[PDB]
């Protein structure tokens, strides 16, 4: 699975998974914390 | 009527001469490089200006420099 | 009170004169 | 997107290569130069990107126009 | 040419080998009948010189200006006809 | 010493059906080039003007509008057929000028006895600045 | 009132905008039955809209001529009037997070530059090394300031290529 | 005696017109026949043409 | 002559070793991405099977399997 | 507007006469060979 994990470590797979997890994290942030116009603490 | 010049960084690999489609460049004997040959341009009146010699020069920076200048019926590559 | 015919004709003649001046300057510049 | 195509369609590779050289100087100053050398898009690359963006932008503009107009009135 | 076989080049006959041909031009004296040829060469006699055929263009331009002087109005044309009231505009203007 | 070969005018031409990319009005009043080569068999080659032609056994004679077309045909003969050839420059007044294999051997191989003109003894960056040659009608690299 | 702006808690046009949005959503409501899935979706949308408007009135945003929140992008003008969360606090947040990402990428570049094949390591990313450097990049400001004071963050101009003027 | 930098050493290019100006290069060979550019320098960084080696003279190359 | 089914038993092994190395299909993409032009050419020549192999048989097999993959995408 | 006839003469002059003469003159001069 060394070659398979090397394929998973290739630049397109890693950038698509990274933008996927970042977009999903931001989406769930807006799902639980919607309409956050300002950083009101 | 294009100005083609050869400079001493030429290593005599003959690639500029082979790349020329109108036979402008040729190899003359020389003593400044290992190959003992340098390029020369005796027939610049047949030069169209395609710069294929520059695309073939491996020296950095290139030794066969083409300066586009006056245009004639042969520099413009016209068949009419 | 709009201008008269003679004023227009005199202006056009003076423009012809300055056109002669202009072509003189152009010929001098070409030489 | 259609007007973004106009960058690639009207410009040429040498300008972008020299600008990339200046940006590479900026990266060298901060030791953040990639080992894979950044090059400007090739001439055929630039033409392909320009025509792809042009057709995408025009077709999508017409698609949005047609669908909005025909779904709002009919 | 000397194209009796497959020889399409000849330095002694370089006229035909280059491709200079008449295509359709043929030499013949007979074409136009009598009296009318003299009539037409008299009609276009002194006009053959470059200066007088230039003067024909000069009188043509004189006709161009004569249309503007008196000729545009003879075929009516709206640019020299009369006018019918006017319009005020968006606000109180004229 | 080397002597240029004469252009044998009565030389057979390759079999060809007639193209539209051949000679035009430039040949009559400026110049048309011509290429001559020796073929060892009857075989089909590609014309620089488009289409396929059959060159015949022995001498083959082909006239072309430009020198670049002649060199394209010569280089495809040299690569796909291993056949050398001679190119000539033919003026309409009658004078014929020998061209590409000028000193016998090909220009990519040294001959010891050529003119080494247009060969500067400096680097690219050793040319003069354009301000130092201002109002001269020459580029900095031809000083 | 920092620049002729009124707070959205007391500005009338903010309440008018909220009322208009809720009324439009109620007009959308008045077509389905009470317990349908579209009815629940519209009720959730209404609740989200009212919560958003009440939160914007609560947080102390400034409204202009009409009821739209305005942000202040001046330190001091936003600090002493209590609107540092408009621009200043998100400025600090972005600077921190962008520095984290950029420092992680930089350290990956300098880590793989001194390997056998730095060319291969940039298309084939060493995932454990990237994960470790992404974790280490959370202390990017202190590391960057330390490397700047050490002089190892910047490169000497005599070792950097330029054009021949 | 041998001339130029020793083979395999680390050198910096002083030719301001070259691609690798003030960069890192390794000497591959130095010709002793009298070549105008006898030093052969190989670079890990390729140029626009795609080559990674070039010939340089004596005064445009300093070691380390 | 004589239309019939002819195939080759197990020509290409099924594993992930060429997935690790992009640009394997063409010789000009070997020895790593020295520039980003390599990255662009890798996608540019992915389906140019003429530049990958000179054999018409391998090109035809690649075309057939690409058709099957496209049919799977459409399905 | 005084002298209404004058535009009717001048506009064709600078639209037809002067432009045709100028274009013909410049076409003659650009291929004069031996000026
Ligand atoms: C650079 C321009 C820019 C800026 C400054 C903003 C800023 C903002 N947008 Mg916006 N947006 C933009 C461009 C921009 N956007 C573009 C181009 C689009 C079109 C795609 C959108 C579409 C959009 C929508 C649809 C919405 C926003 C929303 C928001 C607000 C939500 C803040 C938040 O997510 O909570 C805080 C987030 C965090 C604390 C996470 C930070 C840490 C993460 C995990 C790090 C990520 C690593 C990379 C915020 C003020 C939302 C909103 O409600 O507006 C008020 C919302 O609904 N944006
Ligand atoms: C709408 C048309 C358009 C647009 C958007 C641009 C945009 C840009 N030009 Mg440009 N230009 C144009 C027309 C345009 N130009 C035309 C017609 C010409 C004449 C040929 C020029 C000539 C020109 C020159 C000579 C130069 C520029 C430069 C620039 C850049 C300036 C930096 C900047 O402002 O960052 C803004 C960034 C953007 C506007 C990009 C949009 C942001 C994207 C969409 C975010 C990505 C999101 C998403 C991932 C998108 C991908 C989707 C996909 C994956 C599905 C910028 C990207 C200069 C430059 O390079 O700067 C260093 C430069 O020197 N332009
Ligand atoms: C980005 C540039 C910038 C600009 C254009 C301004 C502009 C302004 N600032 Mg400000 N400031 C800035 C950066 C900036 N600041 C930064 C980075 C900080 C953090 C150190 C501060 C901290 C700050 C404070 C604490 C205050 C201002 C204040 C002000 C306002 C009054 C200044 C004055 O009295 O006359 C000009 C002053 C000169 C010395 C000239 C003014 C509109 C004052 C304010 O809030 O206005 C009521 C105020 O007290 N600023
Ligand atoms: C992490 C890598 C990295 C780093 C540290 C930098 C840093 C810098 N860039 Mg650069 N850049 C990068 C990647 C990077 N860039 C990439 C991939 C591109 C191609 C899209 C560019 C294109 C680019 C241009 C055109 C310019 C800069 C400029 C600059 C400088 C101005 C600050 C800035 O943020 O500009 C903006 C940076 C961007 C718009 C690109 C950001 C792209 C992403 C977010 C970075 C890559 C993330 C990386 C994959 C993370 C790896 C994690 C690791 C653990 C594996 C700055 C020193 C400017 C400059 O020269 O200033 C003087 C400038 O003109 N960059
Ligand atoms: C049955 C359809 C078909 C097939 C099998 C092929 C097959 C082939 N074509 Mg071809 N072509 C087709 C239709 C087809 N084409 C059509 C309809 C057009 C007109 C647009 C072209 C125009 C064309 C050109 C100009 C070229 C080819 C080339 C090629 C060869 C190499 C392709 C390659 O790997 O490049 C790479 C393929 C890609 C990088 C895929 C991406 C292409 C674009 C960017 C996708 C479009 C974006 C898409 C709509 C998504 C937009 C949304 C976005 C926001 C995410 C290959 C044998 C190339 C060649 O050299 O021939 C030997 C060549 O240059 N084709
Ligand atoms: C450069 C200034 C200028 C311009 C742009 C125009 C433009 C125009 N004029 Mg006018 N004119 C001008 C100066 C100018 N005039 C001056 C100074 C006078 C006083 C003698 C007149 C007297 C005049 C009359 C009596 C009439 C016009 C009319 C007109 C209109 C049709 C042209 C025509 O038929 O008349 C021909 C114009 C002339 C014979 C004189 C113009 C000479 C100018 C100064 C030449 C300038 C050339 C410029 C500097 C360089 C351009 C290169 C060029 C030489 C090729 C036209 C819109 C007609 C009209 O009213 O239309 C309804 C009309 O009958 N003009
Ligand atoms: C810039 C100056 C200019 C001027 C002053 C005119 C003037 C005129 N144009 Mg013209 N045109 C112009 C520019 C101009 N055009 C340009 C730039 C174009 C290309 C876009 C055209 C294309 C155009 C078309 C397609 C047509 C005109 C026509 C006309 C005539 C309008 C109909 C009429 O008056 O009845 C008749 C005009 C006359 C009787 C005067 C001409 C002949 C007089 C009697 C002198 C002849 C001398 C000879 C020896 C007898 C008019 C004389 C229309 C026309 O009538 O065709 C000629 C028409 O079909 N024009
Ligand atoms: C505003 C500017 C006006 C300028 C006008 C210039 C006109 C040209 C000019 O004067 O030419 C001067 C020449 C005199 O040349 C010379 O004419 C001389 C005779 S004499 O001097 O005129 O007596 C003669 O001896 C000499 O050989 C000859 O060169 O005159 C001509 O020969 C013009 C004759 C034109 C005959 C045909 C006219 C068009 C026919 C229309 C057919 C259809 C009709 C419906
Ligand atoms: C710095 C000193 C500024 C304090 C001025 C106090 C003004 C009134 C106090 C006041 O306005 O209320 C507290 C204020 C922010 O609180 P908010 O008004 O946003 O609280 C209300 C909403 O958040 C809850 O609905 O905090 C600040 O003053 C700025 C925060 C410090 C900035 C931290 C950055 C550190 C670097
Ligand atoms: C007597 C008279 C008559 C003739 C009247 C005529 C005939 C009037 C003509 C008027 C005209 C037609 C005037 C035109 C003037 C043109 C001018 C003023 C142009 C000036 C150009 C300038 C200043 C710039 C020139 C430029 C310069 C600087 C260069 O050197 C080159 C570029 C260029 C831009 C050209 C008739 C018989 C009717 C009735 C009887 C009385
Ligand atoms: C802008 C531009 C460039 C510069 C373009 C570059 C450097 C390419 C930039 C790509 C960056 C590095 C990637 C950006 C990634 C985006 C977030 C999404 C891109 C879409 C992909 C998924 C395909 C040229 O090289 C060029 C060449 C010839 C004619 C015109 C032009 C031209 O207009
Ligand atoms: S290609 Fe360059 S180095 Fe080679 S012979 Fe020609 S000029 Fe000299």
- Report whether G140 contacts G105 (CB < 8 A): no
Residues of chain J neighbouring E77 (CB-CB closer than 8 A): none
Q: Which H helix or E strand runs over F85?
A: strand F85-90
Sequence-ordered list of residues with C-beta below 8 angstroms from that of I30, at least 6 positions apart, any chain: I23
Using the Cβ of H60 and the Cβ atoms of chain G, whether some distance falls under 8 Å is answered with no
Measuring CA to CA, how many Å separate I45 from each of F19, F78, I58?
Answer: 36, 30, 16
Say whether the B–I interface has 3 or more Cβ pairs within 8 Å. Answer: no
Inter-chain residue contact H21 with G159, CB threshold 8 Å: no
The Cα E58–Cα E31 span in angstroms is 33
Residue B51: how many other CB atoms lie within 10 Å: 18
- How far does chain A reach from its first CA to its final CA, in angstroms? 46
Secondary structure class of D26 (helix, strand, coil): helix
J18 C-beta neighbours (distance < 10 Å), count: 13
List the subunits that have 3+ CB pairs under 8 angstroms with A: G, I
Answer whether G159 touches H (CB < 8 Å). yes
Q: How far is the CA of D20 from the centre of ligand 11 (A)?
A: 11
Q: Is G136 helix (H, G, I), strand (E, B) or coil?
A: helix
Instruction: For residue A18, give every residue at least 6 positions away whose Cβ sits within 8 Å of its Cβ, in sequence order, or none.
Output: none
Query: What is the rounded distance in angstroms from the CA atom of residue F62 to the CA atom of residue F19?
Result: 13
Q: CA-CA distance, F36 to F59, in Å (whole number)? A: 7
Chains contacting chain C through 3 or more C-beta pairs under 8 A: J
Of the partner residues E64, E72, E80, the one whose CB lies closest to the CB of residue J16: E64
Tell me how far apart the alpha carbons of residues G16 and G68 are, in angstroms, rounded to a whole number.
Answer: 11
3-state DSSP assignment of residue F6:
coil
Distance I35 CA to ligand 11 centre (A): 14
F67: distance to nearest CA of chain E, Å? 16
Residue nearest to atom 29 of ligand 2 (CA): D7
Q: Where are the beta strands (DSSP E) in chain A?
A: none
> Is A28 within any annotated ligand binding site?
yes
In degrees, rounded to 5, the angle at the alpha carbon of residue H59 between the alpha carbons of residues H54 and H63 is 75
E strands, chain B, are 3-6, 26-29, 37-40, 64-67
Q: How far is the CA of D1 from the centre of ligand 2 (A)?
A: 10
Burial annotation H26-37 (CB, 10 A radius, 16+ → b, else e): bbeebbeeebbb
d(CA A28, CA I46): 37
**If DSSP codes are grouped into helix, strand and coil, which group holds residue B79?**
coil
Ligand 10, atom 41: nearest CA belongs to which residue?
Answer: C13
- What residues are in contact with ligand 8 under a 6 Å CB criterion? E 43, 45-47, 49, 52, 55-56, 58-59, 62
Q: Is H17 on the interface with F (CB under 8 A)?
A: yes
User: Distance from the CA of E85 to the center of ligand 6, in angstroms?
Assistant: 29
B26 with F107: CB under 8 angstroms? yes
Sheet strand arrangement including G62-63: G6-7, G62-63, G69-70
Residue I37 to residue I31: CA distance in whole angstroms: 13
Residues of I in contact with A1 (CB under 8 A): 16
- Give burial (CB, 10 Å; 0-12/13-18/19+) of G34: exposed
> Are E17 and F13 in contact (CB < 8 Å)?
no
Residue D17 CA to residue D7 CA, distance in Å, equals 14
Report how far ligand 9's centroid is from the alpha carbon of G73 (Å): 14
Asked whether F120 and B3 are in contact (CB, 8 A), the reply is no
| DSSP notation for G52-116 | HHHHHHHHT-EE-SSS-EE----TTTTTTTT-TTTTHHHHHHHHHHHHHHHHHHHHHHHHHHTSS
Tokens (6 digits) for I19 = 């997935």
The residues pairing with I35 across neighbouring beta strands, listed in sequence order, are: D37
How far apart are the two ends of chain E, measured CA to CA in Å? 82
SS3 category, A11:
helix
The alpha-carbon gap from D59 to the nearest alpha carbon of chain G, in Å, equals 33
Alpha carbon distances (Å) from G131 to A40, C18, D34, F20: 31, 82, 19, 67
Which residue from J minimizes the CA distance to C3? J2
- CA quadruple G102, G104, G108, G110: dihedral, nearest 10: 70
Q: Which residues contact F119 (CB under 8 A, 6 or more apart)?
A: B5, B6, B7, B28, B38, B39, B40, B41
DSSP letters, C10-21, are HHHHHHHHHHHH
Question: Which residue's CA is the closest to the ligand 12 atom numbered 8?
Answer: B10
Q: Which atom of ligand 1 is nearest to the CA of A30?
A: 34
What DSSP element (H or E) covers F52?
Answer: strand F52-55
Distance CA D33, CA I36 (A): 13
For residue F50, what are the CA distances in angstroms to E18, F27, F32, F53, G110?
A: 20, 18, 18, 9, 56
Cα C27 to Cα G108, H17, J25: the distances in Å are 71, 48, 15
B11 touches chain H (CB under 8 A): yes
User: What's the rounded Cα separation, in Å, for the pair H3 and C23?
Assistant: 72
Residues 6+ apart with CB under 8 A from B29: B36, B37, F110, F112, F114, F116
**Using a 6 Å cutoff on CB, does residue I63 contact ligand 5?**
no
List H63's β-bridge partners, or say none.
H11
Closest residue (by CA) to atom 53 of ligand 4?
G105
Using DSSP bridges, classify how beta strands G69-70 and H10-13 pair: parallel, antiparallel or unpaired: unpaired
Total number of residues shown for chain G: 165
**Which residue do the tokens 């990674």 mark?**
H52
- Ligand 6 atom at minimum distance from C18 CA: 44
Nearest atom in ligand 6 to J22's CA: 55
Q: How many CB pairs under 8 A join G and H?
A: 17
Place of tokens 């201008």: C3
- Please tell me the distance from the alpha carbon of residue I43 to that of residue I29, in angstroms, as a whole number: 11
Spatial CB neighbours of H48, under 8 Å, sequence gap ≥ 6: D17, D39, H19
Distance G56 CA to ligand 3 centre (A): 26
Q: Is I53 helix (H, G, I), strand (E, B) or coil?
A: coil
Interacting residues of F47 by C-beta distance below 8 A, sequence separation 6+: F16, F19, F21, F53, F73
Residue I59 Cβ contacting ligand 5 at under 6 Å: no
Cα I26 to Cα H1: distance, rounded to the nearest angstrom: 47
Which ligand has the minimum distance to the alpha carbon of residue I52? 5
Residue G161 has which token pair? 């290529």
Residue B33 in marked binding region: no
Domain range list for chain B: 1-80
Q: Mind giving me the DSSP string for J1-35?
A: ---THHHHHHHHIIIIIHHHHHHHHHHHHHT-S--
Domain range for F82: 1-143
CB pairs under 8 A between E and F: 44
How many CB atoms within 10 Å of residue D51?
13
Count CB-CB contacts under 10 A for residue G161. 17
- State the DSSP code for F41: S
Resolution for the entry shown, Å:
3.2
Q: How many interchain CB pairs under 8 A, A with I?
A: 18
Kindly state the tokens that stand for B23. 């036979």
Nearest CA to ligand 8 atom 12: E52
Question: Residue B8 gets which letter from DSSP?
Answer: T
G127: closest chain A residue by CA = A9
> CB of I32 within 8 A of CB of G117?
yes
- Whole-number Å distance between alpha carbons of F10 and C6: 83
Report which of B75, G89, G36, E41 is spatially closest to residue F66, judged by C-alpha positions. B75
d(CA H40, CA H29) in angstroms, rounded, equals 5
d(CA I32, CA I35): 9
Burial of J9 (0-12, 13-18, 19+ CB in 10 A): middle
Q: What is the C-alpha separation between F52 and F70, in angstroms, rounded?
A: 15
Residues in chain F, total: 143
At F93 the three-state DSSP class reads coil
* D28 near H CB under 8 A: no
Ligand 4 centre and the CA of G115: distance in Å?
A: 22
Q: Residue E2 in contact with residue E13, Cβ under 8 Å? A: yes
Say yes or no: CB of residue D30 within 6 Å of ligand 4.
Answer: yes
Judged by phi (left if over 0) then psi (alpha if -120 to 50, else beta), residue H53 lies in beta
The number of domains in chain F is: 1
Half-sphere exposure of D49 (CA within 13 A, CB side): 17
Residues constituting chain D: 74
Alpha-carbon span I61 to I55, nearest angstrom: 10
B interface mutation test: which of H55, H56, H57 has the most B CBs within 10 A? Answer: H55
User: What distances in angstroms separate CA I22 from CA A7, G28, I37, one per listed residue?
Assistant: 9, 53, 14
């Amino acid at each position: 699975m060394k070659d398979f994990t090397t394929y998973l470590s290739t630049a397109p797979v890693l950038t698509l998974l990274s933008v996927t997890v970042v977009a999903g994290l931001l989406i769930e942030i807006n799902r639980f914390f919607p309409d956050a116009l300002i950083a009101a603490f | 009527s294009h100005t083609v010049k050869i400079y001493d960084t030429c290593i005599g690999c003959t690639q500029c001469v082979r790349a020329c489609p109108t036979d402008v460049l040729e190899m003359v004997p020389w003593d400044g490089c290992k190959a003992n040959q340098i390029a020369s341009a005796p027939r610049t009146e047949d030069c169209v200006g395609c710069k294929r010699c520059e695309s073939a020069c491996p020296t950095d920076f290139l030794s066969v420099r083409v300066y586009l200048g006056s245009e004639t019926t042969r520099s413009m590559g016209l068949a009419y | 009170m709009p201008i008269a015919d003679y004023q227009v004709f005199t202006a056009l003649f003076l423009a012809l004169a300055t056109g002669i001046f202009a072509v003189r300057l152009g010929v001098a510049l070409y030489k | 997107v259609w007007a973004f195509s106009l960058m690639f369609l009207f410009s040429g590779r040498g300008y972008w290569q020299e600008l990339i050289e200046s940006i590479v100087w900026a990266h060298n100053k901060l030791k953040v130069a990639p080992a894979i050398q950044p090059r400007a898009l090739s001439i055929t690359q630039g033409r392909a990107v320009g025509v792809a963006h042009y057709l995408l932008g025009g077709i999508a503009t017409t698609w949005s126009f047609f669908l909005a107009r025909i779904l709002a009135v009919g | 040419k000397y194209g009796e076989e497959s020889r399409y080049f000849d330095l002694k006959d370089l006229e035909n080998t280059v491709g200079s041909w008449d295509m359709y031009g043929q030499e013949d004296k007979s074409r136009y009948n009598g009296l009318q040829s003299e009539f037409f060469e008299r009609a276009a006699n002194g006009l053959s010189r470059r200066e007088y055929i230039l003067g024909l263009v000069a009188i043509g331009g004189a006709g161009i200006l004569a249309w503007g002087g008196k000729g545009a109005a003879d075929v009516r044309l709206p640019t020299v006809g009369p006018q019918q009231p006017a319009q005020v505009g968006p606000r109180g203007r004229l | 010493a080397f002597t240029p070969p004469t252009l044998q005018s009565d030389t057979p031409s390759p079999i060809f059906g007639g193209s539209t990319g051949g000679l035009l009005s430039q040949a009559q009043v400026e110049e048309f080039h011509v290429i001559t080569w020796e073929s060892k068999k009857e075989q089909i080659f590609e014309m620089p003007t488009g289409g396929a032609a059959i060159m015949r056994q022995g001498p083959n004679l082909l006239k072309l509008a430009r020198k670049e077309q002649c060199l394209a045909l010569l280089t495809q003969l040299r690569t796909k057929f291993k056949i050398d050839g001679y190119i000539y420059r033919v003026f309409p007044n009658g004078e014929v000028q020998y061209l590409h294999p000028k000193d016998g051997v090909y220009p990519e191989k040294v001959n010891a006895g050529r003119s080494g003109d247009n060969t500067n003894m400096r680097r690219i960056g050793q040319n003069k600045e354009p301000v130092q040659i201002k109002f001269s009608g020459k580029i900095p690299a031809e000083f | 009132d920092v620049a002729g702006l009124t707070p959205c808690s007391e500005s009338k046009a903010f309440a008018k905008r909220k009322k208009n949005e809720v009324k439009a959503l109620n007009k959308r409501l008045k077509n389905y039955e009470a317990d349908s899935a579209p009815a629940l979706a519209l009720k959730a949308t209404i609740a989200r809209t009212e919560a958003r408007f009440d939160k914007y009135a609560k947080q102390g945003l400034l409204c202009g001529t009409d009821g739209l929140p305005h942000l202040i992008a001046d330190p001091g003008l936003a600090l002493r009037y209590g609107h540092a969360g408009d621009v200043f606090i998100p400025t600090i947040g972005f600077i921190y997070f962008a520095g984290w990402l950029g420092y992680a990428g930089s350290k990956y570049l300098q880590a793989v530059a001194a390997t056998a094949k730095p060319i291969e390591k940039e298309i084939i990313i060493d995932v454990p090394l990237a994960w470790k450097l992404l974790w280490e990049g959370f202390g990017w400001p202190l590391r960057a300031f330390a490397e700047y004071k050490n002089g190892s963050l910047m490169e000497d101009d005599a070792k950097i290529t330029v054009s021949p003027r | 005696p041998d001339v130029g930098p020793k083979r395999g050493t680390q050198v910096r290019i002083l030719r301001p017109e070259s691609y690798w100006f003030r960069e890192t290069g390794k000497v591959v060979s130095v010709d002793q026949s009298g070549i105008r550019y006898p030093v052969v320098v190989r670079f890990e960084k390729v140029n626009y043409a795609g080559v990674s080696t070039n010939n340089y003279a004596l005064d445009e190359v300093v070691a380390a | 002559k004589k239309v019939k089914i002819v195939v080759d038993r197990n020509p290409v092994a099924t594993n992930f070793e060429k997935w690790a190395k992009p640009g394997h299909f063409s010789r000009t993409l070997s020895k790593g991405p020295t520039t980003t032009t390599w990255i662009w050419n890798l996608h540019a020549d992915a389906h140019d099977f003429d530049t990958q192999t000179s054999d018409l048989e391998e090109i035809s097999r690649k075309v057939f399997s690409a058709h099957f993959g496209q049919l799977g995408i459409i399905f | 507007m005084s002298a209404q006839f004058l535009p009717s003469i001048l506009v064709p002059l600078v639209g037809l006469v002067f432009p045709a003469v100028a274009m013909a003159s410049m076409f003659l001069y650009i291929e004069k060979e031996e000026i």
